[PDB]
Amino acid sequence: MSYNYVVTAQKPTAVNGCVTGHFTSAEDLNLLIAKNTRLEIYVVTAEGLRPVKEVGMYGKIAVMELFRPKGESKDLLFILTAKYNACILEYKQSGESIDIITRAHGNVQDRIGRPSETGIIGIIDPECRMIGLRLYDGLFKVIPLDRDNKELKAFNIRLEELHVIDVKFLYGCQAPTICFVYQDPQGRHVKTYEVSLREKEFNKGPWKQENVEAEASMVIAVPEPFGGAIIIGQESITYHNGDKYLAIAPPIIKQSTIVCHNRVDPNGSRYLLGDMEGRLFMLLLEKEEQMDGTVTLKDLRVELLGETSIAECLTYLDNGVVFVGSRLGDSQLVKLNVDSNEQGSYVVAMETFTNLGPIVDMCVVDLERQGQGQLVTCSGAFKEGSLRIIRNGQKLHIRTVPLYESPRKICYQEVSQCFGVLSSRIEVQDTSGGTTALRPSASTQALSSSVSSSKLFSSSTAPHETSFGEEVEVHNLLIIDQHTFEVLHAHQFLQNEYALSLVSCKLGKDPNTYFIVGTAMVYPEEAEPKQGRIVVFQYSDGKLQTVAEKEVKGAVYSMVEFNGKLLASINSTVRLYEWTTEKELRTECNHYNNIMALYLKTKGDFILVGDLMRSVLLLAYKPMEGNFEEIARDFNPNWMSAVEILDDDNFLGAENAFNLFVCQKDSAATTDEERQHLQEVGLFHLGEFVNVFCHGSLVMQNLGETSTPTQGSVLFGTVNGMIGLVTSLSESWYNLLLDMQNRLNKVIKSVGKIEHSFWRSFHTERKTEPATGFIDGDLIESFLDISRPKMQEVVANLQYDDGSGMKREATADDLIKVVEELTRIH
Amino acid sequence: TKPCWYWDKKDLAHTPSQLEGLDPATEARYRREGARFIFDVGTRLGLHYDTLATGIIYFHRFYMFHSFKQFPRYVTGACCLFLAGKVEETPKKCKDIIKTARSLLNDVQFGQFGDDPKEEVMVLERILLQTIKFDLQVEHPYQFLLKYAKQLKGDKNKIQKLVQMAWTFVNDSLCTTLSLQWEPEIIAVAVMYLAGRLCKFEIQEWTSKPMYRRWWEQFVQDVPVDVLEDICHQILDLYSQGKQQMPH
Amino acid sequence: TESDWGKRCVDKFDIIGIIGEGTYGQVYKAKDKDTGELVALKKVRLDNEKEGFPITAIREIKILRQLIHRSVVNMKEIVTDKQDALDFKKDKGAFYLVFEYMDHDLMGLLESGLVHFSEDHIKSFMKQLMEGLEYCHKKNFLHRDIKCSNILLNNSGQIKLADFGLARLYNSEESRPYTNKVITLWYRPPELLLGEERYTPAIDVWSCGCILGELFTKKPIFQANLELAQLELISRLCGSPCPAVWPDVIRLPYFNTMKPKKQYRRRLREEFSFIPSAALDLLDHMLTLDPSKRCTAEQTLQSDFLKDVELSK
Numbered sequence A: 001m002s003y004n005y006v007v008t009a010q011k012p013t014a015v016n017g018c019v020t021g022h023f024t025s026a027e028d029l030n031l032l033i034a035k036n037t038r039l040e041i042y043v044v045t046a047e048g049l050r051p052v053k054e055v056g057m058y059g060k061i062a063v064m065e066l067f068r069p070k071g072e073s074k075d076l077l078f079i080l081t082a083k084y085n086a087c088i089l090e091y092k093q094s095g096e097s098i099d100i101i102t103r104a105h106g107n108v109q110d111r112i113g114r115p116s117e118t119g120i121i122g123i124i125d126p127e128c129r130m131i132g133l134r135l136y137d138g139l140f141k142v143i144p145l146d147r148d149n150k151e152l153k154a155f156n157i158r159l160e161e162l163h164v165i166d167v168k169f170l171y172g173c174q175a176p177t178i179c180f181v182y183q184d185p186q187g188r189h190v191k192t193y194e195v196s197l198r199e200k201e202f203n204k205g206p207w208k209q210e211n212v213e214a215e216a217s218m219v220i221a222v223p224e225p226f227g228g229a230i231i232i233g234q235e236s237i238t239y240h241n242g243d244k245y246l247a248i249a250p251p252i253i254k255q256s257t258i259v260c261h262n263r264v265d266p267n268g269s270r271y272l273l274g275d276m277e278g279r280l281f282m283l284l285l286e287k288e289e290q291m292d293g294t295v296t297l298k299d300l301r302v303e304l305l306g307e308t309s310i311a312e313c314l315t316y317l318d319n320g321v322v323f324v325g326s327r328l329g330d331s332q333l334v335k336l337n338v339d340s341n342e343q344g345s346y347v348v349a350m351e352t353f354t355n356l357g358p359i360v361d362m363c364v365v366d367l368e369r370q371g372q373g374q375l376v377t378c379s380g381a382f383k384e385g386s387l388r389i390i391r392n393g394q395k396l397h398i399r400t401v402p403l404y405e406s407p408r409k410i411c412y413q414e415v416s417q418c419f420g421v422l423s424s425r426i427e428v429q430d431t432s433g434g435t436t437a438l439r440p441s442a443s444t445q446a447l448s449s450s451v452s453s454s455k456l457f458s459s460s461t462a463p464h465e466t467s468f469g470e471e472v473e474v475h476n477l478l479i480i481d482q483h484t485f486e487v488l489h490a491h492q493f494l495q496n497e498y499a500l501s502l503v504s505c506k507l508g509k510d511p512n513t514y515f516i517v518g519t520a521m522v523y524p525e526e527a528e529p530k531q532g533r534i535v536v537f538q539y540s541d542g543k544l545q546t547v548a549e550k551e552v553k554g555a556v557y558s559m560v561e562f563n564g565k566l567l568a569s570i571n572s573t574v575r576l577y578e579w580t581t582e583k584e585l586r587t588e589c590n591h592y593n594n595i596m597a598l599y600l601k602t603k604g605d606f607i608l609v610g611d612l613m614r615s616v617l618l619l620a621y622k623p624m625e626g627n628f629e630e631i632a633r634d635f636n637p638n639w640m641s642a643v644e645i646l647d648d649d650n651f652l653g654a655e656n657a658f659n660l661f662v663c664q665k666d667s668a669a670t671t672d673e674e675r676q677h678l679q680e681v682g683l684f685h686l687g688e689f690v691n692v693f694c695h696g697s698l699v700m701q702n703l704g705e706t707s708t709p710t711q712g713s714v715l716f717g718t719v720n721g722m723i724g725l726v727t728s729l730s731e732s733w734y735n736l737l738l739d740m741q742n743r744l745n746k747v748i749k750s751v752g753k754i755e756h757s758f759w760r761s762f763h764t765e766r767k768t769e770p771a772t773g774f775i776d777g778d779l780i781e782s783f784l785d786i787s788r789p790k791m792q793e794v795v796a797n798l799q800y801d802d803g804s805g806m807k808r809e810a811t812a813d814d815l816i817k818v819v820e821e822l823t824r825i826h
Numbered sequence B: 001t002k003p004c005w006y007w008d009k010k011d012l013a014h015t016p017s018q019l020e021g022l023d024p025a026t027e028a029r030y031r032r033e034g035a036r037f038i039f040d041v042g043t044r045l046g047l048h049y050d051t052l053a054t055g056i057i058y059f060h061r062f063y064m065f066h067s068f069k070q071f072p073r074y075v076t077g078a079c080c081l082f083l084a085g086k087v088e089e090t091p092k093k094c095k096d097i098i099k100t101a102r103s104l105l106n107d108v109q110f111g112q113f114g115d116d117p118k119e120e121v122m123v124l125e126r127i128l129l130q131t132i133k134f135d136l137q138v139e140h141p142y143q144f145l146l147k148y149a150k151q152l153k154g155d156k157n158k159i160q161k162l163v164q165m166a167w168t169f170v171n172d173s174l175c176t177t178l179s180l181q182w183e184p185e186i187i188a189v190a191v192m193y194l195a196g197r198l199c200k201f202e203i204q205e206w207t208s209k210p211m212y213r214r215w216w217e218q219f220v221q222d223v224p225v226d227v228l229e230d231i232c233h234q235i236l237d238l239y240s241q242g243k244q245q246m247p248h
Numbered sequence C: 001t002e003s004d005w006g007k008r009c010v011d012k013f014d015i016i017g018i019i020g021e022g023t024y025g026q027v028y029k030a031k032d033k034d035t036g037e038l039v040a041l042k043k044v045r046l047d048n049e050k051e052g053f054p055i056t057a058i059r060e061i062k063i064l065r066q067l068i069h070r071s072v073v074n075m076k077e078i079v080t081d082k083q084d085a086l087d088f089k090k091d092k093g094a095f096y097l098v099f100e101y102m103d104h105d106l107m108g109l110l111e112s113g114l115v116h117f118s119e120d121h122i123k124s125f126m127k128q129l130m131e132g133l134e135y136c137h138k139k140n141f142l143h144r145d146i147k148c149s150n151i152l153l154n155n156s157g158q159i160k161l162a163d164f165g166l167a168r169l170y171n172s173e174e175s176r177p178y179t180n181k182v183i184t185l186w187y188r189p190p191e192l193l194l195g196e197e198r199y200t201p202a203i204d205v206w207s208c209g210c211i212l213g214e215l216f217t218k219k220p221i222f223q224a225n226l227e228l229a230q231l232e233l234i235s236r237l238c239g240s241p242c243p244a245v246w247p248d249v250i251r252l253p254y255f256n257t258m259k260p261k262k263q264y265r266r267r268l269r270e271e272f273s274f275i276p277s278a279a280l281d282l283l284d285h286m287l288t289l290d291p292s293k294r295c296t297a298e299q300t301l302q303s304d305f306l307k308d309v310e311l312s313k
């Protein structure tokens, strides 16, 4: 068996959602911000947001909504986790003591269901009679909000329309009414139903179906003054309410898909819309007076306000202050002004909230020779893409290097006192037949530049037609100085060539230090790339020189330096090249038993291969023979997101289901069959998407070693910005900390009353296994935050093993010491 | 695709056994003894009739590729029955086959098994499996005797007499090379043809074509009477040479 | 000739890697040196020799050489490790069963989460599988273990059934001793859970039905660890075994022994209301409790769902 420890170094930084209401008091305006697994509660003031409370939940936050049922003084909070843990929460403050009350809770998972394409949707009735949940195709689940439903029991109504795009509870109906956009073979349509709690079924809805834009995306419920719904698409915005129908199709929105919306005015006259290129629009509802005294909708208007960070969620807050919640960039506070500035913008940025964003790749480097080490991350996407220098202080000091284009891979080349960074920028097919970039970015603002002239794929004789307006990726290798982070050089790869892998190393007897890039020729027609390059560059005296190119018959997804040889994975094949005295790559040997060789790592003569399915494989280079040998494979099927080697026998993996697992050589050796079975000895539900594993630690080594129970250090980056750390334990230290977790889980009160053991259980749609071989360090480090009575309660009746005192009864203080040393690893 | 498992009578004078100096009578005797050994051993163990036959068929096939002077017959027989049990889903532990073989063989005969009877048997399986070319599935005259008899209608007692008399002839033909000469379907017909001649029964009348004198042709196309008569002659020789007479 | 099995040497294949851990040995992927054809070699180890050549392998060799259908995995030949000459006893080398190489297994496609099945894909899948089951069942061979792991799929969309080990003949007129505990718990029929040792060819239909529901949810339908917990999940959906729907349930060994929590009512149609009706009718019939009322393979092919599918497309 194996024993490992996993802690968070940086909590999730990306806003997954944001809603505002009156949660902490009936009087204050609150902004609730939801980062993955983390809930931040702020109070809106004219000066700014005042933080008041932050809690963690043992679950990924999928639904977050505020509702005030009749009889309550203040808003309550509904949350549904991605594992289908539902709960209703209340803020209660007894003077200084702030606590989150679990008013109702339960798990709403169905034994039989098909998870929907557009993900979990949760909506609440305007009268707060029921909670609507769309969890499975063809089913609508209703949690009725009656005082007695403390377990959140619910029933399913059969839904004829299997492929639902979006649904909202409509305002202004005699009965609870839902409005949804659905897709069937005839296109997309907007339809309504009424929900009957008494009959527990749908009844015919208030207004007829209308077939809508093919790419209709969002349903906006319109307040009672107007009523009805607005349907936002790629080209058109439409309002449907009974017989009334309006359609505005302004060309400005066609340019970029609109993804988020929020209500500025409770009357619904003003709405906010944002798009993927980061623009912010105002959607205006023009109202017409009636002879009856009634108010009808006259027309819709769209006005461009300015540019924000690419936003997942928007909330209007107060005055002109809007909170921009971004998962692809920094979240922001912006001010909307009545008068535009001299550039024509009505938007002025106030504050910038740091988001490490998607961490596509990262490396650890000792820039200042301090011995500590610093973390340089490829963070963000599109214009929000940037490099982030992250270093320990307790609070992490983070310098931001905007790139304004998508960074892909980073590697450090000390000889050249600079970084190599692969990047991709979006250009659009223009009337010239070429392409035009939307915004200047790193690859265009380099000091000196070059472009590949390779004739390898010029043969052509196969067509690829272009239509004006279509996006393309242009990939570049960026040379960036390690002190100034000035873009010294930019190399643009071939048309339709993607840069997938990057390394910095010397090869063979060649003393020159090279940048080597592995590429793929990506044409929309091909399921799998069938052409590719390995390119050897040299950065010398401010210019990048192409040294050698090797044509391959696939995509070079991953490369790694291997004892002076170049180890590269081309589709299924894993290949070892030698670097000749003629400065050319020569193939030595191959391994072909792979579906897709996405990830590679090495240690000595051993190689760990990560696969699209079939998880990880331990290869070995056999120098006596000049070829590879399969040592052991993990037969259990998994979809890998990143892999790392812990030691000569233990191997770490990351799944696309947000799970971490560890495999070990079976070290039985009785039969060859046992040797070739990597046995999963560690299973852990992380809750984040791990893109990159990287050996190192950000802690300052005082250059004198002081012992820590943990041994080894692997850092990892995630899509939501989390930076975590994995380390190994001795059997004894694991059992002590494991035993203590079980004690801590009985003592600590969870938000939503979510069992910790459940949360960390390995989970795919098909499997759920209990965690094993992993210590949830974030639980362990919470011992230092529980009240003294609880500290002693946790440590009651404790012993120990493998020590000077063979069994050691613990004092609360004894453990306080052990945990505090554990907090020093990050 | 599939191998051919049938030789001509004339070809049998060139078995390895013949060419190592064994005369035709001796190979025939060895064949009957090995077959009756498989038959008797499996019967003591309670085995289905197909399992016995399958073992016997493997055994007869084996000594078309090997010599009786280099591969002892009772060891071979035991191995055949062992594999036959696994093929036909009537399996037995090798030790039990040895136990029964020792009960039935004298001290000289059991000498063929050497110092370690089980090992000598288990070792042959590799050779047997290669010799039979891994064509494990085998059909036997029994199933066709019943498939064909089911389409004969008339005097219940006369048809039952034919079937049992013929069934006896099938058991006896396992002691011969007929298993190697003609497909099992012909054997089933041949035994029906013979029983009919011995019981003075005219099988034609019970067929759906009562004036088709050549009744077999509705069961087995393209079988000359010559073949059925040759088979009959070979089955009867065993009865004439032994003290045993036609069952009737 | 092509029929002289057991003599060709495994030298003729370049071993590419280990595709899987097998029952009677490990399974490897390989390229034929002469033709360049990718094959899969199943190792048969008799070095243990506890009972010699394994029976599980003997079943797969006896049956798969007789069965030739598009949807049944083809055994191409049997090859051996280098055989030392002049010591027929000393050789302990292993034999290898050569099969065609199938790109993926359904379980792996599903476990990795990499596939999406539209209604038409499920039609093409089931039509091939059940047509193959009809071929095997018409030949009176029962593929007692049917799971996702045993259904192999090429990128071409061809489905082929595999691992015909644990498969035996069934006399239609009579019944003999049978093993009873013969399918994986997730895909086991209720009859075998209650201990029937005279299993019908319908044991396989239940498994293929479990798969049919699995293909519409991407999750197995009956997931339990213990035989009782399994009967309970089946009963929550199909109703509790009782003479009202399964007269002979009382003749089965453990009917009194293994009662579910309640005498549930059948909800199959309700919990699967999202499935197309053509399919739901097929599922409802395939997952019938009584082995005698459970549809046959031929009947599934003569269903509104699978009858009019063109396998050319």
Ligand SMILES: CC[C@H](CO)Nc1nc(NCCCc2cccc(C)c2)c2ncn(C(C)C)c2n1
Binding pocket: A593, A594, A595, A614, C018, C019, C020, C021, C022, C027, C040, C041, C042, C073, C099, C100, C101, C102, C103, C104, C105, C149, C152, C162, C163
């Ligand atoms: C019982 C063992 C496995 C379980 O799936 N069965 C299995 N699987 C096959 N291929 C699917 C997986 C291919 C694969 C696996 C691992 C790594 C990589 C790169 C690829 C297969 N092809 C042919 N056969 C014949 C022998 C019946 C097969 N039998």
